[PDB]
């Protein structure tokens, strides 16, 4: 999975995810209303303020995202963090404890900025406990972003609970953040402009075509390959105007690193690749995803209607793997 | 530029390429219906026989194709061939003489099986001429498909003119076919198979996440490196069922290798990157296109009112 | 710099480094006998117990060493972890108070098991004080061994002083050894066993020559780099038989990391490159070394002799 | 296998090669004198007339060499070119016919200037000849190399006889030199200037150490990779003065790019690596190797004894494998 964001020249926001997996999930696009039921495990039980878009799945009335946004601007994808994600054995007391799954609403139903985010999480606890026992607990980090920051939230058997800031606005898969950060260091030769003409000892060595500057970026799947070709793809593509230009700038980016069907197979003889790449546009309140097997970009939308729905917006099942 | 092609299961041709480019030229779909005047300048004058469907502009009436497809399903490519193309001073008595812009309708005019072209090409020259003074001579080489068989065509100042049965479906730039084709030996060590855990003296050594059997896959936009990475997207992708999940198998190998804006800047200081990726299906005549600002699919289409129209069908630029 | 450290298949053990630097120190191999003396800024002045031998320079008769190995077995090389490495601004009462200068010296005269000076570390403040103040302060971290383990030590900034078990047996400069061992993990596709003839769609695709296994290797001198190469190195030669195979066999792996003279310009304008290749062999209490200008290999040796001397022992520049 | 040459200030030439071999061949030093006996084939047998030296084997009396170097400062080695190499099925009426293992010796005994071999290879024909039937033909190419000039000679199935120049002065094995000509195009981006700090929309990306500049440089042993290392390293050295600073700069690139034994195991589950390095200073006419197991360097003359002997010089072969 990579996850991505920008802005257009006017501060609108573009943020999304490729979602690469080994099997099918079952999701969907969820949209939830305002007013629609809200339990939490160790708070108090209310209702949702604001309403949300997002890919994921019910599981007893409760929409279980693996990413959504707000009717505000302000989203959150998790993405798997593997052999380094861990989670509070049990509620803290003083804290605010909350399921790990339970973050993405959270996040969504109180908070626009992403400012307030960072200040409230000082005292969240999130804790290692699935919404029921039939699932297990995904060991995920997160990225969560406004129009005007984004940052990585990750919680490690190795650091505790981090939160930093993501001025790439790209996140990926594991090792954890600095780690990705700190390699972005050895890439430093990169250049996005050609190398010309050279003489080795009287030998003419000259390039065959565009593109030499870039000598050793990754193509591969591996997640420190696709954070270092995002980012680097991420900072060098220039702010374009406009919401078809936007949203195919999103696309162009997140299809370059995706996981390609049948260039990775996992230890289990599966395999592993790119199943959807969503955008969600602020400035529309608009939901933009495509298939692997289903090409044309889909949408869905925070409208009216929808954010004021007695029960919650199910699309059924596209299906894959 | 990266052309590629593949087949379904029941042997239905998906072909086409991105344009990847430092500059604009106009282009649009242009349609260029049967019975359409179709000048030469070393053989007779004629007119067309099939209908055609490709990306290009028109000069003077001619439709001059980036790439273009006949409704029998046969097709061609041209994509830039810089330091090696280079086409005859003139016209040589006894050889089907070609200006090497008109190879595009001359293949696909005369020609339904690439078994065929290849043949008629061992009495074919290509000529350094373009349309006209006021446009250079485009230096070229071409990939050539139908559901059977893709052909790459290389005429070279280092080599003359080659012929290249093309089993990897895919073609970019210079250097010339065989280079790359040697160049794949180099990449036997990829693997789409994951690595699993290892012991190094006594320390576990893990993957962190899936995709290590790929370590060493080229990311960059140099033509060596996304001729690697197309061939070996395309080779390991597994055949699929069906016309959209076909289209959308040709999109995704094709926007894994696309030239990104803004990383590509040339020595002119210019941003090369994909313009347009498109894709051609044979089994309903279709020519699918998105645009690096426009991502939403586009489609055009050989039908009985477009294959006979009393002109060229030309969409916006 | 990379230092590296082996056993043979009787525990003797072998241990050094390259020295890769962008300027001159005027250094040379000392030999410290017993019972000289050894000022301490923070501790009881005291005397040698154990003659060391190493690079280094002598500085108001107190030898600096870069790298340096006592006559019972246990080394230590000095490397350069530049923006990581900090040490306390003063001494603390409580702790074993050091100069980071003199842990040098304080390792190789009081330990001869790292087991115990890892133990001891535990009570250890390293200071930011050089010798004197005509001399900055290095920003080292190191790698301690003998015969059973080695261990690195380093103190940042960002997370304080850290010591680490090296299974890999290697050591090379910046960022922090966590960072480096966790990055072997996206390294699990490169093997030693080659590549075979493989079918792309029916094109034949076959090594041109062995090595294919290793693709994505990296060859080039970012110490990430040469950390990658050399703990692969490492774990994969073969334990070697005897003196003289097992200090070929140092010298062949280190001189395949080495930086090599006009392959690296600094920021400043200087070449870096590895100016000397050393190897301490504790069964023969021999050290070993060859320089950039000067291949064959010279030898310095603790003896009965070296070990008891009423001076420095030092050799050429 | 790489093979590399360079000069000193004053044109004193330094040239030799790595033997990276998955098996034992028995070799070792032979010193070949004036006026010993020198059948051909194809030709009227003659005496040598200039002394050489190398490693080789000897077969029946005939010294054959993996690499020979004559008394006038002219030397020739033979790497393997293993699926292109192809010589001719027979000798041709009107050429000059060697057996291919027959050059080494028609190189160091008639010539001393690689500008002339090139002209008299105009006439030559390789042929698919072994010493006797008992020995197999190798397919190798070769690099021969004066203090002026180094030439590729190369007779493939798929190009013919190719004689080229060699302004990098190395070589290494499959494919073609051509080929790995064209490569080097492919590494332009290549810089051994370091890079510095950088700014990823805001976010401070900088070196960790030196070396940044040569990011992509490849260090595994496939032949191109050593080719490109190799030259790029050979071309990147500056000219240095004595001969001991020559000879450890020439033993400081092959060592660089030496195959390290447990990296590489071929098909058949043997080890390849690097089993010796040698050197050849014309000027002192002496003979530098080690070996992957006796590091310090060896030496072997010529001289007016050994240049004037009656038989041949044979050191016994140091083992390996
Ligand atoms: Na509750
Ligand atoms: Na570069
Ligand atoms: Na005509
Ligand atoms: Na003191
Ligand atoms: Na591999
Ligand atoms: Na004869």
């Known amino acids: 999975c990579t996850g991505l964001r920008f802005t257009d020249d006017q501060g609108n926001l573009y943020f999304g995810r490729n979602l690469d997996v080994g099997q099918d999930y079952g999701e969907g ?45 302000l989203g959150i994808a998790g993405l798997n963090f593997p052999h380094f994600a861990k989670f509070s054995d049990g509620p803290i007391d003083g804290k605010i404890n909350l399921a790990s799954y339970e973050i993405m609403l959270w996040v969504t139903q109180n908070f626009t900025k992403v400012s307030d985010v960072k200040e409230a999480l000082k005292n969240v606890n999130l804790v290692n406990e699935a919404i029921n026992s039939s699932f297990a607990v995904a060991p995920l980090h997160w990225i969560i972003s406004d129009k005007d920051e984004a940052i990585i939230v990750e919680v490690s058997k190795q650091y505790g609970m ?5 001025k790439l606005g790209v996140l990926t898969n ?4 600095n780690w990705h950060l700190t390699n972005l260091g050895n890439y430093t030769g990169l250049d996005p402009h050609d ?16 593109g030499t500057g ?48 049948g260039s990775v197979v996992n230890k289990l003889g599966s395999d592993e690749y790119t199943v959807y790449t969503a955008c969600y546009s602020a400035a529309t309140k608009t939901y933009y995803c495509n298939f692997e097997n289903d090409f044309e970009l889909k949408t869905y939308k925070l409208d009216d209607e929808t954010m004021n729905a ?8 596209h299906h894959h793997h």
């Open 29 to 73: 696009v969820i949209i939830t209303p305002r007013n629609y039921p809200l339990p939490y495990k160790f708070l108090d039980n209310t209702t949702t303020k604001k309403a949300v878009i997002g890919m994921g799945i019910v599981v007893d009335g409760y929409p279980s995202y693996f990413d959504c946004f707000n009717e505000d601007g």
């Open 162 to 166: 981090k939160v930093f800031d993501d």
């Open 174 to 177: 594991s090792p954890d953040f």
């Open 195 to 210: 190398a010309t003409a050279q003489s080795w000892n009287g030998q003419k060595v000259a390039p065959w075509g565009v």
């Open 214 to 261: 870039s000598l050793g970026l990754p193509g591969d799947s591996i997640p420190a390959d696709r954070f270092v070709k995002a980012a680097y793809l991420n900072v060098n593509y220039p702010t374009v105007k406009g919401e078809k230009a936007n949203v195919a700038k999103f696309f162009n980016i997140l299809k370059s690193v995706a996981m390609i069907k």
């Open 310 to 317: 007695d029960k919650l917006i199910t699309y059924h099942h």
